[PDB]
């Protein structure tokens, strides 16, 4: 995690995937002021390991690309460090029914 202050050099942002095994995830410390996952409208997000991604896609018999999508540059996907292919579990406070689990894949 690399917390910059105002920006990074554009020649230096070409070197963010320059380590292929280890990822570099860069944040602006003005955008880190409020934790967005404490907001009332952001539900609880839980990343799923591949023994419950696979049991999700067995229960509903889905391809990976048939789930609802979360972007790679989403504010909560940059928060949790969601790689492409990771399935997050959202616990929504539904109006008619209370707590309600929903899923969403990162592509």
């Amino acid at each position: 995690i690399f917390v910059y202050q105002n920006n990074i050099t554009p020649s230096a942002m070409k070197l963010v995937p320059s380590i292929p095994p280890a990822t570099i995830e860069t944040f602006n410390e003005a955008a880190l002021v409020v934790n967005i996952t404490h907001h009332e409208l952001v539900p609880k997000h839980i990343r799923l390991s591949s023994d419950e991604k696979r049991e999700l896609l067995k229960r509903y018999r889905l391809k990976e690309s048939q789930l609802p999508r979360i972007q790679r540059a989403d504010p909560v996907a940059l928060y949790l460090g969601l790689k492409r292919g990771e399935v997050v579990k959202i616990i929504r406070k539904s109006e008619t029914s209370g707590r309600y689990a929903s899923y969403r894949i990162c592509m």
């Binding site: 952001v42 690309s65 048939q66 929504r92 109006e95 029914s97």
Partner: protein, 1465 residues
């Protein structure tokens, strides 16, 4: 369609593709003669009506040899001699032409950069997106042994990436194309065509090619190349003419041979298992095809025949192909022969351009272009794809004007004998219907219970029209004789009988805004009638008023479609609406106003009267009883004269239509009629049903009208939809025969007050003579009742008139004071000061019962009209102060402003007759602008959500398989089932009747019982251990029981909100029924109230936003409202909302005093807003000088209103303002060549001036009030060369531009009234990054905008989804309209399905699979071009795709298959 002719084969999928120039194997007609006809009308050989193209004019076709009614027609081809380009694919040949190198003949991009997009678009044709980004992981004057090593290694990953997913169950041999797979692929090809198109020179050759430039879709010009570029070409690889289109072909046929690794994946979206080659001939038309003769028959008009339009631009092609055929021989037997030839290519290109498109070709350019061509035959609202595929015209249908009837059933229609002797049904004759179908042949076409045709087993018909009785009686005995033919021995005959009383019928109206405007009525054939005839319970579902409306009547023609208008689309199952579960069906006016008389306490009936009202409504012959005998009650008075009561007739009609095994109905409800209207200590507002007996209270609209939780809505829940439709039919006949025996009338005495109550309103309206002045004397800020003609009040009222804001303040104070006098009269006179009272007054009884009208209408008849409010204001007023020429100018009167103290009983005066005509017209111009507001909003909702449906795993999925939700609303409950679900007292009163409805005896041996009850008690106990925790600190041990267990299989897997309600009932109450055996009822009632798989919840959700929005269309009574708001959320998904806001919750310690100080530290302050005056004294002489003097307000005024200190005015005037002013004085000089005074400053004030003289152009002097801030001062000098300038009108514009202090993207912050305790601050403009630094004031964890594109940008995609459902609900809750959250959750989950905010439009439709949904929506021949270039296989699974191919739809009855278990091996 005949059911005796099955079809074994059917179409699964449709491949798009391009016809090659080998139409020669298809077409051997060769249409070359441009002459079409001759003398004596024979079609010329070779011409465009050639008889090898189908039979024509009683001839036989030269190819198939069949007549005009058996020939299909055949396709001939026009040989074009030169390859004119295909005008659909011109924009994509001009992409691969602009990106090619003419010297390398590869491209103008590096051979490994082109290889990378050949390698990412290959991983995307298989269903794998993760590996196409990890191709960019594989990297490390470079020699080619490394660039062939990078090529040989990326191709090794793809062989490993495919053969891993292809060895697993992830992808197939034909790929795993989806919607997001299409999204990523539509981005790379849009990016591959962006890196090809912008490069200058060839990275593979170094030499390079000139730059092409085109015109409006006719010509390619190879532009000349300047000598600077040639000098690079001569040194590198040597170690504007029109281009003839055979040379554009030889370039692209050389490009595509080399680039066959990359273009094999750009043009193919699924894998290319036929392993064809992307050839260059696909973009140029070597030949044409000509559609067959049947598709080109002569288009007559009036009573004369004219030539077809599509031959008029296909002969103009064919003369020009004859011109060029001769002139090629003119050149070859040996100038002007090329200018005669190149000019011919200008028009043979343009004529085939005009043949396909029409807006492409200019041509004559005189207007009204003929022959619209084959694109304009497809693209319009009409086109071909919306007027003849998505909508059609049908056989076996009728339409007619409808007329009321209370004597037919509620589920019936009255069919005239005009329609009855026409509409027929192919009934197959068998052993059981032969007794009825012999008589139909003997009756024949004349009598109604008859036939018109019999169909034999060879398919041949026999009409029964010209026959007589002896022919028809003979044939009728031959219906079961077997044929001698053995090929048709399976079949039987089919009599086309007339439509009987056991048929059904779909009715309809012209705006079919929801699915209860098309329902399954049964048929009753009524003699002596000429109009269709409909019961009153259907008048609210079709939104029908009986004033000459026509209804379309559809008669379905097989047993499959009959069983669905009986069971699914019938009127009995459409009792509750799918919008919010409200009932839509009930009795209307004379039935509402007879139940107040029948069930009154005065209504006594003798014995002869009692049995006449029971049998007059309930007949055992027609099947209304349940006991095969009419049962009665003992009278409620025995001895003096035996009498029944009117409430006791209602008990008898429910004792005969409800089944005898179940117990009675137990209901405790209310009425609309108050307990003081009936007298002293009455209880007739309380409706009590005990054991099916009305014991108390009259019946109103609230009970058997279209109203929830009454008696008809409660019999629907306990007894079922069939009983509640019989009860409306019985009551519709009971209150009709009661009205016939005992009538209802409205008179002139029903409209009259008594002599004391007329005196009351004369006193109260006398107290309004001062009211118009009291509100006038208030707004002017005078006091203590100045007289009306006071010359200082008239000065102030004239100022109010000249300003639009101040006039509405006068109108809002005065319309709030005369409406106090209005409601004092009505509160004194309407219920109590009348002459005839409610158990005889019909005008009051019609409004209390809800029969017709309201008490606002009764009060205008009887007391006064009141304030006539116009555009949300009062009466408009002339320039002269006058509101009419009768009144005095600036007349402070209520009546002069449009207050009517007259009433409709005594008449209204001519002045106030004129103001009431003003309010009558503004309600009619709004209807002039409201005839279709929401037509395109509902259409565009209903096509994205067109195949969204409940699946058998209860997951809400789209038609192509892509998941939208995981349950319907998170509980999977139908809206039309949830109505008495949280009514726990009603279900306990009716425990033993709901127990044999939701029958658990023959139920529980199929379904697991004790597995989800055990898990829910784990979670419920655990969800109480974490109540006070915030939502981010919540547990993840226990996801809800609905996620783990199917609610339709496991008894007890119930939503966590219904679980909390049933526990809160079973604890706060304690009432021979246990609480343990009451859990088992409601948990089973949840299990039987679930949505069914195959429910089209996508169409329903679109109909539940579109149909209640036609109500949502009114004008002014700040924020965007109504349909113009809902065309921003749902449609177009704008990032530029007109009025974006932000809602800021404030803490506990910060008071309202400190919040108002906080709003003044956010709201922007212009320097305009702190200036009283600007004095600009211009002088000349010496240099034109300019002395700008600024009067500010008092320092304790702008540093109270605006929170701007006078040390902040200095830092804006010196730093910002003068640079803006001197920018505009210079900018005018460019266009020009084309009181008190103070002095004696000290050293602080002197050297501040010295910094400003050195830092601006023409300033030289400056001062500021550093004592009080009341004034500023600076003295510009310009040259004498300059002329007169309006310096004030530059200062007025720069002072209105210079901000003092603006927090960015935010204009204003306001402190509104706290609703529901929510102390909030509303902020005109969105910037979440600014409001996070205000954490001592604002609860930053609870701030919420309406700009969804901003909440998506900052708080993720799940917060944007929440912002959608609360901004659609705020649109509907503002007009008091309720839609379910299940419909709003399904729209926000369709917009945020890509992690973005997609509109319902053409651009949000691009991320979708089915091409026919795109073609049928709009821009038909742009999605068609995109589908052919993609080589896209239509899988035929959206409901707009199946109608094109003529396939059974995949929703509801088509969501499964029926298979027949045959006994023998």
């Amino acid at each position: 369609m005949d059911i005796s002719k099955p079809v074994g084969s059917e179409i699964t999928s449709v491949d798009f593709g391009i016809l090659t120039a080998k139409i020669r194997n298809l077409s051997a007609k060769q249409i070359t003669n441009p002459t079409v006809l001759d003398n004596l009308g024979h079609p010329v050989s070779g011409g465009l009506y050639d008889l090898a193209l189908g039979a024509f004019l009683r001839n036989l076709c030269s190819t198939c040899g069949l007549d005009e009614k058996f020939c299909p027609g055949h396709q001939g081809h026009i040989e074009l001699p030169v390859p004119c380009y295909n005008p659909l694919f011109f924009n994509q040949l001009y992409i691969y032409l602009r990106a090619s190198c003419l010297f390398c003949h590869h491209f103008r991009l590096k051979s490994v950069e082109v290889h990378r997009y050949a390698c990412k678009l290959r991983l995307l044709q298989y269903g794998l997106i993760d590996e196409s980004y990890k191709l960019d992981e594989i990297t490390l004057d470079i020699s080619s042994t490394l660039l062939n090593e990078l090529k040989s290694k990326r191709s090794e990953y793809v062989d490993m990436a495919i053969a891993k997913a292809l060895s697993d169950g992830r992808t197939t041999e034909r790929g795993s194309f989806t919607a997001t797979v299409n999204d990523e692929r539509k981005k790379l090809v849009h990016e591959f065509h962006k890196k090809l198109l912008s490069r200058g020179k060839c990275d593979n050759c170094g030499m390079f090619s000139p730059k092409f430039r085109k015109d409006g879709f006719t010509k390619i010009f190879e532009t000349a190349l300047n000598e600077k570029q040639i000098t690079n070409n001569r040194v590198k690889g040597f170690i504007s003419t029109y281009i003839l289109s055979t040379e554009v072909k030889n370039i692209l046929d050389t490009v595509f041979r080399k680039e066959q690794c990359v273009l094999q994946y750009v043009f193919h979206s699924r894998p290319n298992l036929s392993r064809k080659l992307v050839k260059a001939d696909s973009f140029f038309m070597d030949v044409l095809v000509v559609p067959p003769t049947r598709f080109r028959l002569p288009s007559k008009l009036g009573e004369e025949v004219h030539e077809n339009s599509q031959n008029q631009l296909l002969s103009k092609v064919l003369t020009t192909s004859l011109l060029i055929r001769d002139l090629n021989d003119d050149l070859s037997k040996l100038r002007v022969i090329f200018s005669r030839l190149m000019n011919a290519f200008v028009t043979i290109q343009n004529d085939v351009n005009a043949f396909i498109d029409s807006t492409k070709a200019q041509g004559r350019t005189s207007g009204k272009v003929p022959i619209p061509g084959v694109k304009q035959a497809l693209e319009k609202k009409e086109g071909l794809f919306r007027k003849h595929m998505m909508g059609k015209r049908v056989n076996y249908a009728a339409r007619s004007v409808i007329s009321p009837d209370p004597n037919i059933e509620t589920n019936e229609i009255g069919v005239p004998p005009v329609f009855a002797v026409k509409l027929t049904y192919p009934e197959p004759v068998t052993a059981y219907n032969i007794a009825e179908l012999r008589q139909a042949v003997i009756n024949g076409p004349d009598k109604w219970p008859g036939a018109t045709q019999i169909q034999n087993e060879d398919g041949s018909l026999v009409s029964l029209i010209g026959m007589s009785v002896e022919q028809r009686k003979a044939l009728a005995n031959q219906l079961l004789t077997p044929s001698s033919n053995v090929s048709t021995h399976t079949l039987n005959k089919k009599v086309y009988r007339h439509i009987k009383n056991r048929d059904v019928v779909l009715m309809n109206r012209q705006p079919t805004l929801h699915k209860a405007s098309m329902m399954g009525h049964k048929v009753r054939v009524l003699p002596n009638e000429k109009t269709l005839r409909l019961h009153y319970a259907n008048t609210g579902a079709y939104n029908a008023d009986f004033d000459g409306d026509e209804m379309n009547m559809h008669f379905p023609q097989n047993e499959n479609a009959r069983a669905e208008a009986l069971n699914l689309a019938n009127t009995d199952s459409q009792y509750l609406t799918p919008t919010s579960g409200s009932p839509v069906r009930g009795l209307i006016q004379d039935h509402i106003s007879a139940g107040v008389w029948l069930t009154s306490k005065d209504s006594f009936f003798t014995r002869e009267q009692y049995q006449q009202y029971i049998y007059g409504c309930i007949r055992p012959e027609d099947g209304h009883t349940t006991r095969s005998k009419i049962v009665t009650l003992p009278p409620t008075i025995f001895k003096p004269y035996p009498l029944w009561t009117g409430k006791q007739i209602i008990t008898t009609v429910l004792l005969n239509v409800t089944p005898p095994d179940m117990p009675g109905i137990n209901l405790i409800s209310k009425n609309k009629i108050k307990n003081e209207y009936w007298g002293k200590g009455s209880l007739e507002n309380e409706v009590l049903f005990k054991d099916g007996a009305l014991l108390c209270g009259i019946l109103d609209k609230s009970q058997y009208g279209a109203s929830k939780y009454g008696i008809v809505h409660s019999l629907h829940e306990v007894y079922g939809p069939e009983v509640a439709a019989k009860v409306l039919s019985v009551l519709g006949r009971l209150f009709t025969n009661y009205i016939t025996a005992t009538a209802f009338t409205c008179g002139m005495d029903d409209l009259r007050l008594t002599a004391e109550g007329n005196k009351w309103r004369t006193d109260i309206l006398k107290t309004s003579v001062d009211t118009g002045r009291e509100a006038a004397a208030e707004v002017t800020n005078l006091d203590k009742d100045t007289p009306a003609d006071d010359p200082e009040l008239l000065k102030r009222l004239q100022e109010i008139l000249r300003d639009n804001n101040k006039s509405g303040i006068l109108d809002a104070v005065t319309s709030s004071k005369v409406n106090a006098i209005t409601s004092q009269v009505v509160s004194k006179c309407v219920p109590d000061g009348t002459m005839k009272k409610f158990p005889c007054n019909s005008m009051q009884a019609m409004a209390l019962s809800g029969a017709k009208g309201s008490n606002v209408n009764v009060s205008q008849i009887m007391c006064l009209l009141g304030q006539q409010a116009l555009e949300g204001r009062r009466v408009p007023v002339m320039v002269s102060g006058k509101t009419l020429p009768s009144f005095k100018p600036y007349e402070t009167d209520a009546m002069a402003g449009g207050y009517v103290k007259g009433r409709f009983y005594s008449g209204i005066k001519p002045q106030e007759y004129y103001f009431h005509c003003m309010a009558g017209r503004e309600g009619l111009i709004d209807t002039a602008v409201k005839t279709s507001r929401s037509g395109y909003l509902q259409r565009c909702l209903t096509k994205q959500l067109e195949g969204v449906h409940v699946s058998y795993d209860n997951s809400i999925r789209d038609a192509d398989g892509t998941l939208v939700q995981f349950m319907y609303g998170g509980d999977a409950i139908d809206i039309t089932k949830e109505s008495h679900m949280t009514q726990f007292e009603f279900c306990l009163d009716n425990y033993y009747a709901l127990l044999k409805k939701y029958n658990p005896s023959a139920l529980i041996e199929h379904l697991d019982v004790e597995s989800a009850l055990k898990y829910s008690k784990k979670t419920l106990k655990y969800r109480k251990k974490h109540s006070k925790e915030p939502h981010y600190k919540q547990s993840v041990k226990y996801d809800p029981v609905l996620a783990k267990y199917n609610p339709a299989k496991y008894l007890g897997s119930v939503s966590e909100n219904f679980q909390d309600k049933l526990e809160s009932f079973l604890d706060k109450n304690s009432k021979g029924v246990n609480e343990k055996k009451f859990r088992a009822l409601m948990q089973l009632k949840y299990m039987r109230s679930l949505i069914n798989p195959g429910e089209a919840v996508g169409i329903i959700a679109s109909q539940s936003v579109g149909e209640p929005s036609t109500q949502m269309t009114l004008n002014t009574f700040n924020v965007t409202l109504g349909i113009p708001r809902l065309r921003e959320i749902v449609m177009t998904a704008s990032a530029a909302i007109k009025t974006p806001q932000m809602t800021l919750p404030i803490w506990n310690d910060v008071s309202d005093e400190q919040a108002d100080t906080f709003c003044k530290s956010i709201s922007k302050v212009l320097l305009s807003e702190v200036i009283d005056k600007v004095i600009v004294t211009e002088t000349t002489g010496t240099a034109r000088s300019y002395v700008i003097h600024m009067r500010f307000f008092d320092n304790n005024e702008y540093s109270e209103e605006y929170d701007v200190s006078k040390e902040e005015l200095q830092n804006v005037i010196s730093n910002q303002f003068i640079h803006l002013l001197e920018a505009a004085i210079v900018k005018e000089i460019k266009k020009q060549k084309r009181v008190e005074a103070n002095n004696n400053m000290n050293k602080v004030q002197r050297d501040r001036q010295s910094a400003i003289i050195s830092h601006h152009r023409f300033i030289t002097k400056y001062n500021f009030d550093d004592e009080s801030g009341k004034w500023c001062e600076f003295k510009l000098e310009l040259a004498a060369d300059t002329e007169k300038l309006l310096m004030v009108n530059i200062v007025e514009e720069i002072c209105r531009k210079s901000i003092i202090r603006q927090i960015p993207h935010i204009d204003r912050c306001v402190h509104p009234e706290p609703e529901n305790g929510k102390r909030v601050l509303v902020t005109e403009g969105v910037n979440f990054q600014a409001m996070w630094d205000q954490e001592a004031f604002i609860d930053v964890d609870g701030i919420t905008s309406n700009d969804v594109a901003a909440v998506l940008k900052t708080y993720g995609v799940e917060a944007a989804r929440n912002t959608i459902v609360n901004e659609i609900n705020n649109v509907f809750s503002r007009y008091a309209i309720s839609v379910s959250f299940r419909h709003l959750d399904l729209i926000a989950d369709m917009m945020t399905r890509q992690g973005t905010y997609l509109a319902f439009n053409r651009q949000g439709m691009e991320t979708s699979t089915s091409s026919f949904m795109k073609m049928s929506y709009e821009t038909t021949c742009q999605f068609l071009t995109k589908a052919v270039l993609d080589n896209e296989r239509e899988q035929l699974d959206s409901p707009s795709a199946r109608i094109v191919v003529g396939k059974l739809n995949n929703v509801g009855t088509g969501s499964f298959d029926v298979l027949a278990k045959v006994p023998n091996a």
